[PDB]
Amino acid sequence: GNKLFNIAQRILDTNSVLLTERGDHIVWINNSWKFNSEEPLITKLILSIRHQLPKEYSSELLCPRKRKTVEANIRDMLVDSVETDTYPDKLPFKNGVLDLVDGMFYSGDDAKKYTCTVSTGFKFDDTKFVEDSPEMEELMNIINDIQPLTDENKKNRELYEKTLSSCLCGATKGCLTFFFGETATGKSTTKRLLKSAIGDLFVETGQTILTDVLDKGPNPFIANMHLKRSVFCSELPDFACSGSKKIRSDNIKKLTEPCVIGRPCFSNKINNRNHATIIIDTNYKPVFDRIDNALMRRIAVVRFRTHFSQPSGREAAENNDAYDKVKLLDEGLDGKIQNNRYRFAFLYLLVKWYKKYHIPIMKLYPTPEEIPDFAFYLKIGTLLVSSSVKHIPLMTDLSKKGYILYDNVVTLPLTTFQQKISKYFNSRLFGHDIESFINRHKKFANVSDEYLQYIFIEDISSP
Amino acid sequence: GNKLFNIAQRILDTNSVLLTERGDHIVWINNSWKFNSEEPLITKLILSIRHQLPKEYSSELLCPRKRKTVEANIRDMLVDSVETDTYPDKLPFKNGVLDLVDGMFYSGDDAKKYTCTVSTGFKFDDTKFVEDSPEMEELMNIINDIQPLTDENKKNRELYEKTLSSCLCGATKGCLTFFFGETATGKSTTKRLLKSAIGDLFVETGQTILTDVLDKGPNPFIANMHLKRSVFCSELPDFACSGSKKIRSDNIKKLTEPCVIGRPCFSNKINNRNHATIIIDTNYKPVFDRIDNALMRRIAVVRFRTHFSQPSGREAAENNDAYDKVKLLDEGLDGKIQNNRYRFAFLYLLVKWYKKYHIPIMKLYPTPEEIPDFAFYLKIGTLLVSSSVKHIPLMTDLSKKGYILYDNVVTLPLTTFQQKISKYFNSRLFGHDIESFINRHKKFANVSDEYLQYIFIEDISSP
DNA sequence: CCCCC
Ligand SMILES: Nc1ncnc2c1ncn2[C@@H]1O[C@H](COP(=O)(O)OP(=O)(O)OP(=O)(O)O)[C@@H](O)[C@H]1O
């Protein structure tokens, strides 16, 4: 009995509705997996696949009440969760899945085995996914204008290519990249090109994810990054002028983890999967509230140094020290990019870069030598080291150099340490930094009298 | 009559739905005591159980309306409230429960009597639960490298072993474990190994729980210790910097209490049971403003004295004092531990350590000596003893020494006390301790008079 | 329920 129960069982036997570990209901319609808590996806699937059931079952599914009964039966039948979005080298489209390691495009049940629950939102066109075209030469000219193929720009260009290509691989990336440069240098053009290329896998959020508390309450600004392969933030302010909050290192470290806590309004799903490449456009370098060794492992910088100016302001730009090259501005390029002219050309370029930079494992490495905020830590980290045991047979040398021994621990006088620091970094130049380092790296032998359990590398080098 | 009432009664006879003190229901589907406030779990269980009922009842449960009526009956029958997680010698694994006292593993229905809602998160395998393993040998070698098996490095090893074994205890512990050391001392890799070994029973929280109010408003960090056998803290804010908040001895005592304060968001069930031992990882000595016998009974310290470094910097690493023994670092160890390679060997190691520590009671013990902050408290407790009239039979000796009889009590002037202490503990080297003593125990009987209501142990011993 | 506070 229960024709409706039989219909629900038949639909469940097709493996077209699945329950995820988070609590979602993903359905397979029109050659793609979709989930949406606001749309009647299960009844949509029932109506869509009414054609694959017997003729006596097809006519029963034209009634919304009966479709809702079938949906209730299916919901009670789904008891086990599944693992979704586990292939980091598959790019999902609206009509199939592209193999990023092989170049094969799968449609239908071939693409169904990879439970890719997101998509670009548009259809793959193999007649445009071609190497040579009128659009490809123009796109290559644009890219070579933005990032010149010169010898002094080799490393920066390769880093730019790697960062752009990493927006295809759906895994957790462990760095935050900063597109730094002066005005009119191509950063927004690059952003728009990437958005056109990867479609719905691209999202843009606010600086609140960098300068606010992520726990909070309902946070759609974080909940909108679930499974996105690229996240953009833009327009960092100048932190030198007091009045702007600094970037939270806690947020920076929390954004590189495989899961991020944040939930929408009227929703109970708090944890989102992190597959994102986070890129920040800025005219100014970042300043963080607190600097430590971990934070320095998650920051990378790509610099833009080509100006596109109108003919009136070309001469003033040619004498600027923030530009290496000046080019003529193009006034139709924005519209051409907006109309998705270079979508498949840039997609092909990104796939080629993915192949080139995906030597067995692809990983993003930090560039801490570019951020001025990290210079004080980087310099002093190679000059002073903790107490020494194998250098214990040098206590006479330490005493002659000014150090003292206390429980076989090297201690330096505060005044002597200040005088030594003044040589490498002037007091007038970095008094706040030197005083903070003295107060932070030193232990308190008393309320007033204290000592630093850190000796200079050069002092120990002296025999 | 009321066939649906009969069905509900028969389902209730199987003890598959229970009502917990938190207000929610727990159901037994697919061999797991699972609960949800968002899923139709009771109707799912009804549809699954329908096979066990008679034939005339089985065809009744194919209608969602009938299942809803049966659910209404079943949840109107549930009047008595029960409790979960009542057994401390059991480990819940994804497909059963392992017994600590008996060394037996029960699968399927045999795990039903144990109302365990949380689990480690990996299937229990008997074949890999063996001693003849190539993995346990390398694991023991790595553990020996991190903690040398020597007389000088024995107390630290014992404390480390007890802290690791505490995660298998299903009870409340009053001690908080601390990891102290230098860079690459094994703390992070030990944390990774423990996370791999215990699966979902490990949570990581920032520094908010330590440097903020534990209750405050919403405290997800505090609430995450709810049935979390291990709590981790990383990148602690060293106290040498001036202008940072402090960890509270009141918070330490609250964590030592058998139910720590903590609630989830939009919730009132703050009475969350505590089976947690907190592991705090840092690199600098903590500073506590108020230090006393109560705080000294709830503070544990474990110090690392090893370092692995590159061969180019191997001699420089061996030079340092923070490394008792210096070895050569292996870069693949990170991936090896992140891949959960030695999970069964580590689990058997912890089980064997628990068997060695199988005393009816297994309680953690503070190690206040290691922390440099508690040295002053040890000196004060061993030297500063309250003195007053109850030992009146020393008046002649006090007059001979130079003291006075204030109602036949033992007291010394503040200036005299400072002059006497100047020989033992330097005033410049004990300024904070002297100020605290003067503010606390320097009791006087007059506004202008200066006296202290205590005498040194030497003054007590010598008449 | 969010927002508001
Ligand atoms: N290769 C190119 N050749 C000619 N014109 C270009 C080229 N790339 C970009 N342009 C144009 O020159 C200007 C460059 O400004 P664009 O918005 O790209 O960068 P930006 O000012 O650095 O960005 P942001 O919005 O982050 O400040 C735009 O008007 C753009 O259309």
CA separation, residue B26 to residues A291, A358, B88, B111 (Å): 46, 47, 20, 15
In order, the DSSP letters of B197-263 are: HHGGGEEEE-SHHHHS-SSSS--HHHHTTBT-SEEEE-S---TTSSS-----HHHHHHHHSSS----
CA separation, residue B302 to residues A367, B192, B213, B249, B284 (Å): 34, 17, 26, 19, 13
The first and second tokens of residue A99, run together, are: 């193999």
Resolution in A: 2.9
**B242, B315, B429: residue with CB nearest A449:** B429
Token pair 């930094």: residue: A433
| C-beta of residue A70 within 8 angstroms of C-beta of residue A11 | yes
Antiparallel, parallel or unpaired: β A271-273 and B105-107: unpaired
What letter represents residue B102's amino acid? Answer: D
CB neighbours (10 Å) of residue A208?
16
The first and second tokens of residue A203, run together, are: 């999202």
CA separation, residue A40 to residues A51, A191, A227, A277 (Å): 19, 34, 22, 32
Where b means 16+ CB within 10 Å and e means fewer, B1-32 reads: eeebebbbeebeeeebbbbbebeebbbbbeeb
Angle between the N-to-C axes of helices A134-146 and A343-357, in degrees from 0 to 180, rounded to the nearest 10? 60
CA B240 to chain centre: 25
What letter represents residue A287's amino acid? Answer: V
Which residues in chain B are contacts of A409 at CB distance < 8 A?
321
| C-beta of residue A263 within 8 angstroms of C-beta of residue A218 | yes
CA A369 to chain centre: 20
Determine the Cα–Cα distance for residues A8 and A2; give it in Å rounded to an integer. Answer: 10
CA separation, residue A455 to residues A379, A412, B317 (Å): 15, 7, 14
Surface-to-core class of residue A6, CB atoms within 10 Å of its CB (0-12 exposed, 13-18 middle, 19+ buried)? middle
What letter represents residue B344's amino acid? Answer: F
CA separation, residue A73 to residues A12, A43, A360, B43 (Å): 10, 12, 46, 10
- Please give the backbone phi and psi of residue A173, each rounded to the nearest 5 degrees, phi first: -90, 145
CA of A93 to C1' of C2 (A): 35
Query: Distance, CA A172 to ligand 1 centroid (Å)?
Result: 30
Q: Is the CB of A354 under 6 A from ligand 1?
A: no
CA separation, residue A411 to residues A425, A457, B367 (Å): 21, 14, 26
As a dihedral over the C-alpha atoms of residue B111, residue B116, residue B119, residue B125, rounded to 10 degrees, the angle is -20
Helix (H), strand (E), coil (C) string for chain A: CCHHHHHHHHHHHCCCEEEECCCCEEEEECCEEECCCCCCHHHHHHHHHHHHCCHHHHHHHHCHHHHHHHHHHHHHHCCCEECCCCCCCEEECCCCEEECCCCCEECCHHHHCCCCCCCCCCCCCCCCCCCCCHHHHHHHHHHHHHCCCCHHHHHHHHHHHHHHHCCCCCCCCCCEEEEEECCCCCHHHHHHHHHHHHHHHEEECCCHHHHCCCCCCECHHHHCCCCCCEEEECCCCCCCCCCCCCECHHHHHHCCCCEEECECCCCCCCEEECCCEEEEEECCCCCECCCCCCHHHCEEEEEECEEEECHHHHHHHHCCCCCCEEEECCCCHHHHHHCCCCHHHHHHHHHHHHHHHCCCCCCCCCCCCCCHHHHHHHHHHCCEEECECCCHHHHHHHHHHCCEECCCCEEECHHHHHHHHHHHCCHHHHHHHHHHHHHHHEECCCCCCCEECEEEHHHHHCC
Determine the Cα–Cα distance for residues B345 and B137; give it in Å rounded to an integer. Answer: 9
Determine the Cα–Cα distance for residues A320 and A342; give it in Å rounded to an integer. Answer: 31
Is B67–A76 a contact, with Cβ atoms under 8 angstroms apart? yes
CB-based contacts of A331, cutoff 8 Å, min separation 6 = none
Instruction: Give the max Cα distance, chain A.
Output: 101
Query: Distance, CA A235 to ligand 1 centroid (Å)?
Result: 15
Q: Which nucleotides of C are covered by protein (CB under 7 A)?
A: 1-4
Classified as helix, coil or strand, B185 is coil
**Closest C-alpha to A160, from A201, A122, A190, A125:** A190
In DSSP terms, A92 is beta-bridged to: A97
Distance in angstroms between the alpha carbons of the first and the last residue of chain A: 95
CB-based contacts of A45, cutoff 8 Å, min separation 6 = A11, A16, A17, A27, A28, A29
Is B240–A75 a contact, with Cβ atoms under 8 angstroms apart? no
Ligand 1 atom at minimum distance from A337 CA: 31
**Whole-number CA gyration radius for chain B:** 30
Check residue B25 and report its DSSP letter.
E
Check residue B432 and report its DSSP letter.
H
Query: Distance, CA A345 to ligand 1 centroid (Å)?
Result: 19
**Closest C-alpha to A357, from A199, A177, A93, A160:** A160
CA B283 to chain centre: 19
Instruction: Give the max Cα distance, chain B.
Output: 104
- Where do runs of H (alpha helix) occur along B312-455? 314-319, 332-338, 343-356, 374-383, 395-401, 414-424, 431-440
- Shortest alpha-carbon distance between residue B313 and chain A (Å): 12
In DSSP terms, A32 is beta-bridged to: A29
CA A325 to chain centre: 29
CA separation, residue A281 to residues A149, A201, A209, A236 (Å): 22, 19, 14, 7
**Closest C-alpha to A414, from A390, A400, A434:** A434
**Whole-number CA gyration radius for chain A:** 29
- Could you tell which of A330, A336, A346 is best to mutate to test the pocket of ligand 1, judged by most ligand atoms within 8 Å of the CB? A330
Determine the Cα–Cα distance for residues A159 and B402; give it in Å rounded to an integer. Answer: 80
Classified as helix, coil or strand, B376 is helix
Considering all nucleic acid strands, name the nucleotide whose C1' atom is nearest to the C-alpha of residue B265. Answer: C1
| C-beta of residue A72 within 8 angstroms of C-beta of residue A135 | no
| C-beta of residue A66 within 8 angstroms of C-beta of residue A45 | no
| C-beta of residue A259 within 8 angstroms of C-beta of residue A274 | yes
**Closest C-alpha to A45, from A73, A5, A17, A80:** A17
Surface-to-core class of residue B70, CB atoms within 10 Å of its CB (0-12 exposed, 13-18 middle, 19+ buried)? buried
| C-beta of residue B433 within 8 angstroms of C-beta of residue B376 | yes
Distance in angstroms between the alpha carbons of the first and the last residue of chain B: 95
Ligand 1 atom at minimum distance from A192 CA: 18
Classified as helix, coil or strand, B357 is coil
Q: Is the CB of A183 under 6 A from ligand 1?
A: yes
CB-based contacts of A366, cutoff 8 Å, min separation 6 = A175, A296, A297, A298, A299, A300
| C-beta of residue B213 within 8 angstroms of C-beta of residue A412 | no
Sign of CA dihedral B292, B294, B295, B298: positive
What letter represents residue A414's amino acid? Answer: L
Determine the Cα–Cα distance for residues A34 and A16; give it in Å rounded to an integer. Answer: 11
| C-beta of residue B56 within 8 angstroms of C-beta of residue B50 | no
CA separation, residue B196 to residues B162, B206, B328 (Å): 18, 20, 24
